[PDB]
Amino acid sequence: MISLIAALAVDRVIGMENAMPWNLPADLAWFKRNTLNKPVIMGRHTWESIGRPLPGRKNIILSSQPGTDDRVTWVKSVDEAIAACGDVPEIMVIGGGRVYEQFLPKAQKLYLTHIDAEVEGDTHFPDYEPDDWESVFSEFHDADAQNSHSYCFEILERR
């Protein structure tokens, strides 16, 4: 099955975490916990923003450009990224914006973290409608010493 995992400010705004105006270690731990031991598919700018392969995961980079690191797998299309994952129970797509667009129609599961912030940006997670997605998990948290904003984890399943 294919799943997307993303952190969304209000209005589904997304971005690179190292430039988002928040500190959310709890969400980063949520991400790691839900991606560990699974293939992760990411776009090139997401690759560059991370700066290193994610340990304990097969890293696949979807780009039209030739590869620049043998520690990860470089593919040129959505179908190739999927094929490169081989035979696994769950494929995690980790952005960014265009990658989320491309994979959403093939996905059965969403792991969303909603962040209580208004942040300007021209990139958004694609529209997911209640008609198509059943929310099967939600877990609300408030800001604290480590975490700058209210954040809510949500898992949805395609109806």
Epitope: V10, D11, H114, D116, A117, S138, D142, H149, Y151, C152
Partner: nanobody, 126 residues
């Protein structure tokens, strides 16, 4: 499933505090807003706040006089109204966003309501 309270008579220059309490487990995934309507006139946007309470938006007519706040543990939003004046006189209503996790701007500029309060009359003397 919204219920306002507070309101009634206040002297000009005075303060009034409104609250809006909700029933329902999904309250804290929605933006909330305050509106005001006088008989036979337009309903007017007053304030909005995001789902988690951190971010607010106000009409220029109430900016710096009114504050909206939120307490998700109590499923409640509040409107603190200071420096009140006669033309603030109106029925005040709270409304829940019909769409989850939107900005204050989207709540105001792309209307979609899931729920409205019964309204509470606010009356400012002169």
């Amino acid at each position: 499933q919204l219920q306002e309270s507070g309101g009634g008579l206040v002297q000009a220059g005075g303060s009034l505090r409104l609250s809006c309490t909700a029933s329902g487990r999904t309250f804290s995934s929605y933006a909330m807003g305050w509106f005001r309507q006088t008989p036979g006139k337009e309903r007017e946007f007053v304030a909005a706040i995001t789902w988690g309470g951190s971010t607010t938006l106000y009409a220029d007519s109430v900016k710096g006089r009114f504050t909206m706040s939120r307490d998700n543990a109590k499923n409640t939003v509040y409107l603190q109204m200071n420096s009140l004046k006669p033309e603030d006189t109106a029925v005040y209503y709270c409304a829940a966003d019909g769409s989850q996790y939107r900005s204050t701007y989207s709540f105001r500029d792309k209307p979609d309501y899931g729920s409205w309060g019964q309204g509470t009359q606010v009356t400012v003397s002169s």
